[PDB]
Scaffold this motif. Structure first.
Motif, short mmCIF file in Angstrom:
data_model
loop_
_atom_site.label_atom_id
_atom_site.label_comp_id
_atom_site.label_asym_id
_atom_site.label_seq_id
_atom_site.Cartn_x
_atom_site.Cartn_y
_atom_site.Cartn_z
N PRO A 140 1.10 5.49 -0.70
CA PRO A 140 0.43 6.66 -0.70
C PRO A 140 0.59 7.40 -1.92
O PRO A 140 1.59 7.57 -2.65
CB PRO A 140 0.65 7.26 0.49
CG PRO A 140 2.19 6.78 0.76
CD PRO A 140 2.30 5.52 0.09
N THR A 178 0.83 -1.27 -0.12
CA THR A 178 0.09 -0.01 0.08
C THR A 178 0.92 1.35 -0.24
O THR A 178 1.59 1.68 1.12
CB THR A 178 -0.81 -0.03 1.10
OG1 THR A 178 -1.89 -1.11 0.92
CG2 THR A 178 -1.76 1.14 1.21
N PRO A 199 -2.19 9.60 7.71
CA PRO A 199 -3.07 9.06 6.64
C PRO A 199 -3.96 10.34 6.03
O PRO A 199 -4.57 11.01 6.84
CB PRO A 199 -3.81 7.92 7.06
CG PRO A 199 -3.89 7.92 8.48
CD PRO A 199 -2.91 8.99 9.01
N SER A 200 -3.73 10.43 4.63
CA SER A 200 -4.63 11.40 4.11
C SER A 200 -5.58 10.85 3.14
O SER A 200 -5.07 10.58 1.97
CB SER A 200 -3.67 12.68 3.58
OG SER A 200 -3.80 13.78 4.25
N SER A 201 -6.63 10.77 3.26
CA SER A 201 -7.78 10.17 2.38
C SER A 201 -9.00 10.10 2.98
O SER A 201 -9.29 10.00 4.08
CB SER A 201 -7.22 8.81 2.07
OG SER A 201 -7.43 8.49 0.67
N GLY A 202 -10.21 10.74 2.03
CA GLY A 202 -11.48 10.59 2.54
C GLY A 202 -11.57 11.46 4.16
O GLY A 202 -12.46 10.97 4.67
N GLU A 243 0.18 10.96 -4.33
CA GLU A 243 0.37 12.42 -4.13
C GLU A 243 0.46 13.04 -5.12
O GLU A 243 0.56 12.36 -6.39
CB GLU A 243 1.68 12.82 -3.37
CG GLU A 243 1.37 13.44 -2.05
CD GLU A 243 2.22 13.88 -1.15
OE1 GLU A 243 2.98 13.00 -0.73
OE2 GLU A 243 2.58 15.12 -1.15
N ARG A 244 0.27 14.34 -5.38
CA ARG A 244 0.12 15.07 -6.43
C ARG A 244 1.24 14.97 -7.51
O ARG A 244 1.27 14.86 -8.49
CB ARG A 244 -0.03 16.37 -6.36
CG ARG A 244 0.77 17.12 -5.23
CD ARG A 244 -0.16 17.51 -3.86
NE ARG A 244 0.95 17.74 -2.82
CZ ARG A 244 1.84 18.79 -2.71
NH1 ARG A 244 2.00 19.48 -3.68
NH2 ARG A 244 2.57 18.85 -1.67
#
Length: 116
Positions: A16, A14, A113-116, A18-19
């Motif tokens: 992450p 998994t 964690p960055s999501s939803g 990113e832009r």
């Protein structure tokens, strides 16, 4: 009758997203590993200057020693040259055995964690 070997490469799971940004960079940006710490930007380029001229050569330096980490990045002029550099192993610089890398997608420690 000789023999011997060993290694240990993680796998991880998994990753992450990113832009990212600057694709042309990572695209034509190879991460050189094992510079011996005695190979400067130039000294390095002098090597990766044949396959092609590096439009940008950066050499990371120990964040604690503030000398040399032994790895950097080489930005070729064209995607061809770099491609040639890729199929030009092994690599010996400073009289040592180095190891180039695609650079793309590289270990980048983070947190939260960055999501939803």
């Amino acid at each position: 009758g000789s023999s011997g070997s060993s290694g240990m490469e993680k796998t991880l799971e998994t990753v992450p997203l990113e832009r990212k940004k600057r694709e042309k960079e990572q695209f034509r940006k190879l991460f050189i590993g094992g510079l011996s710490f005695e190979t400067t930007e130039e000294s390095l380029r002098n090597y990766y200057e044949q396959w092609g001229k590096l439009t940008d050569c950066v050499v990371m330096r120990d964040p604690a020693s503030k000398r040399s980490r032994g790895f950097g990045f080489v930005t070729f002029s064209s995607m061809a040259e770099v491609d040639a550099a890729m199929a030009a192993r092994p690599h010996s610089i400073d009289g040592r055995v180095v190891e180039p890398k695609r650079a793309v997608a590289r270990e980048e420690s983070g947190s939260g964690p960055s999501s939803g």
